[PDB]
Structure formats: C-alpha cells, structure tokens
Symmetry: C2
Subunit: 351 residues, 2 copies
C-alpha cells in the first residue's frame, strides 16, 4: 500500500510498523533518508522479505513409490556409499538435508555427498528433477553430478569437490597479484557464460562458493539445490543494486557479484564487514560500488575491468561472453601459480 | 557308465571309486546289498551328487543398474527398514544372504527379513523375478511377501512370520492328540493344494518349516528362495522313495513328506535319528515307511490317512486335493487348541 515522505521533517508517512521498526534499527541517518527516500524504502521491503529461499533448476529438456522408483531409474547406482567413499566429514545439516565431504576409495579423488530424506520432504519431485537436470548440465568450471545411491528413504547425491579449499581461505591468508586474480576471473567467467547459456542465474557468486584444486583448477558451487555443498542473517555484500532495490533482474547480477569478488580478492576481506546489514543494503542501492582502501596501486586495465563489472546501469554492465574478451584476462598467469597460495592457506588454517 | 553285481560274492563290478568309498562307509550289509543291489546303487548316486542346490520360482505370468532399477520399480518401497522394524535378531547367514526376524513397530506383528547383496550375486535377475512372482503368489497358509527396501547394494525382502515358533518345538516338548494332528495336517494340505496348483513343489515339508501363530495359525516356509527364512549334511528323513532312487518325481513327494511329518508329530522325534545317512537312504528306497514305536495306539482312521500318504506307489498315493477330503481331517480340533502347547513349548525352550 502507498506510503509517503514529508520532505522537511524527513518522516515517511503511512508505512507498516515492520518497516518503521527496521528503519529505527537501520543506522540510516535522516540526511541519508531525505537524500534518497525511495532507495531506503526499497531496501526495507527487501530485508523484511528476504528469507533467502531455495533454488531448483527445473530446466528439464502425493507422489507414489512406483513414481519415485521410475524417476530414479536413470540416476541411482547399486552400490554402498559407506563402502565406496572414506574420510567422511560432516560439513553441514539443515532442512535441505545433510552434507559431507569424502574421498573415492578407488580414484583417490574428493567428493561431496548430499543426503536427502525422500519421505520427510514434500517437494520430492523437484529434488529428483533437479538431479535429472544436473546429470545433463556438465561443465568443467562447475561441480558436476557424479553418482547417486538409494539407502532406504535416504538418497545420496555425489557431486565433485576439490581438495584446495575455498577462494576465501586463499584471499584471507595470502596476497594475490593481478595475474592470479585474472586467472580466477577467467575461470569464473567461463562458468557464468555456461550457466547463463542454460537459463541459470547463480545469484551467489562470492569467494565462499569458489572452489580450488591443489593444481589450481577452479569450480563454482551453489548454483542449484544439489550444488549447495558449502557451509552457509549476515550482510549480502555480493548483491547487485537492482536486486536490493527489489527491482526485476537478470544474469548480469552475477557479473556485479564477480566484480565485488575481484575487490575482495585484492583487499583480502569483503566490503561492509562491520556494517549494519540495513545500512549496507542502503549503501549498495545508492552508492553502488563500495570504496577501495588503496585504489592507487591497481593497474589501469584492472580498473577498467572492475568498471565494466560494477557499472550500476545494467545495459552498460558487461555480459560474461563480453568480459571474457576483456584485455585484463590477457594478464592471467597459469592456474598452477595458485598452488603455493593454496598450500600457504591450508598451513595457516590448521584449526 | 554301466556297473554290475556278482550275485554270490556280493560285489559290485566296475563302479566309481567315489561310490565304492561311500559304500564302505555306508553300514549297508552284504545281505542288504544282495537283497536289492539296484536300490543301493541308486542311493549311492544320490548322496554323491545331492549338494542340496537352491530353488527359485521362475513362474512369472551382465545386468545393468537401469535394468535393476526398472525391475525393482514395482517392488521397492521408500522407507528405512532399520526404523520400520525393531527387535531385530539375526537367525542365519550364508551365500544366499543374511536373515533376521523383527517386529513391525506400527502393527506390532512379527516379520522375517532377508538381506541380499545385489552386487555380490551374479544371479541378480533370478532373485528379482523370484520376488516379482512371490508378490503375486498369495495364500494364508504360506509366508507371504510383505515389502521390500533398497539400501545401497543390499535389498531387504520382508516376509510374514509368526510368534509361536516351529512345529518341531511343539512336537519335541509336548504330546499332540490326533485332533490336533489333523488340524495341522489340514492346514498343510491347504498350503500344498495351492502350491501344487501353481506348479510349485515344496520339496522340504517337515516340522522345521511349519510355522505356528500364538492363536494356532499355521504357515509353510522354504518353498522358494525368499521363503527360506529358517535356520538350516544330516539325514533326509522327509524324502520320498522316488527322490532318493534318483528317479523322476512330482508333487506327491510333498504328500509323502507330510506323512513322515505326521509320524514325527505322534512319535515326538523324526525317523532315522541316530542312523548313518547312507543307510537311512537305503532304508527309504527299499522299505518305504520307517517302523512305528507303538503303532497299536493309533486310530484306524489315522492309520488309513498315513497309508494314503506313505503309499510307495506314486499312482496309489493321495494328492493334496484328495486327502483334504479324507475322513481323518473331520476329527480336527479348532486351531486355538494348539495355543497351550505352543506356550508349553516356549516355556520349555528358554535357552
């Protein structure tokens, strides 16, 4: 319902008590409110309603046990997941199932295992169709579906994984040069080109969801339900302005998030770290890019790259297929150059 | 290859060294040998070759995981067998899988669970077809298929069971009257009529494979692969003469075995208990019926029943559909009359 704004007093008129509550807790000043009331009102609407939600790739080119067994025909192997994999470690649990990392005993290569109870979720058909899609959606810069197993009522879905940890672990414990950063950016853009070409928007490009191999190979995770194989309230620093303004959005939100990720790689921490989430959302909507700590060090060509990623105008902002041609990615080192940083990160992590 | 017999010396000529070995260990006398050499030679052939074997009901009106999942479509439930059943007790294990008894937590009724590894058996198709058949083969005097569950590579098959133990436990610890014996015989004949009507020969009718309910209900087990839910070299006391003479045989072998079972019920132990297995087989082939310990006590009409069951001539011997009309079964008590004997048996068993 319509709400107003009395410009000299700086008070919104007729807004819900939820939005008024949030506004009091927001640390947005009455200067910042009268500067742009519409931006404030948009980010109140967003935070009041962003329960995060789930994502399922229903892009496939009440349920009974025969229907389930029929849908599972093409995707279930006969095998014991407690015998095919060792070094199980539980990496998380929630309504969405339980997640483990483990290693294949025959190949010696690491995997992630999501364990879904098919009786306790009503959206059974969505989960299975998600798996059917993911079996056919194959690319080297995403974690791919490997295998699945039925264990009574539990379905085990096995995804690729990598031993070298997350890009956050590298970025927090080491300093990357621009030739390393361009190599990461190239592999993430190769992933985004493929996902966008299959009507997938990732929505959550950040260093936490970028996985590194010990040889320096790079994969994205958290693009689907099955690919959520990461431990994950807080501040949504990776989000683009059209998202937090509650406006319509499309695949170039992932290009913004990649830009913020490139900032995080050169600054070692994400933006808005100690900020109130509501004020961080306000700043994203009004200012766009956060402000750099030491911007004078960065090459012209990296700054051009960041500008094409973090342009607030969606039409001006690069697409994945375009930014793959951007001259910054010419500077990229071999991916093996990440190896010493991955090892440095691991030896710092311990814990 | 042909072997002979020199009638005055009492020596077989030209027989294999296996059969000669067995003959030395057989405790069959040279009198008994020259009395009927052919019977001896038949039972040597039988014992040398009876590795028991398995039985599969392939009466349905190299394998890949999609083929397996397709065959399992109609028979696998989605559920956890380690959650649907409690009071698991392991009752046996062999090449054929592992067997448990357990009770359904919701119904409060006892069940048997066979647990089959589908990777470690090559005859996968036979096992699944056995289950598909058994799902449609339903009768109250056999243990029926209830449910099945897939647990990785292990298939769990759930069969009915009964709390009152085996007829052997009743027959060894109590004395049955003829009206109790006729009630058991009636229910076993009801089972054999149905099995014979579906081209099934049981082959192993004995008190060990007769299951009792606490209310006195009666079911057969060990007619198929899935129905082998009983702990089970030794002497084959239940076998008919045409079987042990290695001759062709048909469903009236079950009627012989039922006759021997009726003897076991009134005598409290099976025949040939302390006998050499080779001599027991010789006696079955030549004498037919074993000799009763106290035959003067038994009614005329029970003796007529036993005669129709234990006639050595297959043509004279009763069929199930015929013996169901035999006047002995008119004497049958209500099945509840078994209840005190079942409880007496259990309270003796303890252990």
């Amino acid at each position: 319902i319509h709400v107003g704004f009395d410009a000299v007093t700086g008070e919104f008129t007729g807004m819900p008590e939820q939005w008024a509550r949030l506004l009091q807790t927001s640390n947005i000043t009455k200067l910042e409110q009268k500067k742009n009331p519409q931006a404030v009102l948009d980010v109140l609407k967003f935070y009041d309603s962003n329960t995060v939600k789930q994502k399922y790739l229903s892009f496939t080119p009440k349920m009974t046990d025969e229907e389930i067994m029929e849908k599972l025909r093409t995707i279930v192997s006969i095998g014991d997941p407690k015998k095919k994999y060792t070094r199980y470690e539980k990496i998380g649990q929630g309504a969405s199932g339980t997640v483990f990392t483990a290693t294949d005993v025959a190949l010696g290569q690491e995997v992630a295992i999501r364990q879904i109870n098919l009786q306790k979720q009503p959206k059974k058909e969505l989960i299975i169709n998600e798996i059917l899609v993911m079996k056919e959606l194959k690319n080297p810069n995403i974690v791919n579906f490997l295998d699945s197993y039925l264990v009574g009522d539990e379905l085990f879905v096995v995804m690729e994984y990598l031993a070298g940890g997350s890009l956050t672990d590298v970025v927090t414990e080491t300093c990357m040069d621009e030739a390393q950063i361009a190599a990461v950016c190239r592999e993430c853009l190769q992933a985004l080109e493929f996902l966008h070409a299959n009507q997938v928007i990732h929505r959550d490009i950040k260093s936490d969801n970028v996985l590194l191999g010990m040889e320096g190979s790079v994969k994205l995770t958290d693009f689907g339900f099955c690919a959520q194989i990461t431990p994950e309230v807080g501040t949504p620093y990776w989000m683009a302005p059209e998202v937090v303004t509650r406006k319509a959005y499309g695949p170039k939100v992932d290009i913004w998030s990649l830009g913020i990720m490139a900032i995080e790689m050169v600054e070692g921490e994400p933006p808005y770290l100690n900020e109130n989430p509501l004020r961080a959302l306000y700043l994203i909507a009004t200012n766009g890019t956060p402000e750099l700590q030491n911007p004078e060090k960065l090459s012209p060509i990296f700054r051009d790259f960041l500008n094409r990623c973090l342009e607030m105008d969606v039409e001006k902002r690069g697409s994945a297929k375009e930014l793959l041609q951007h001259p910054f990615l010419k500077l990229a080192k071999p991916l093996s150059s990440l190896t010493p940083l991955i090892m440095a990160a691991k030896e710092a992590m311990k814990s």
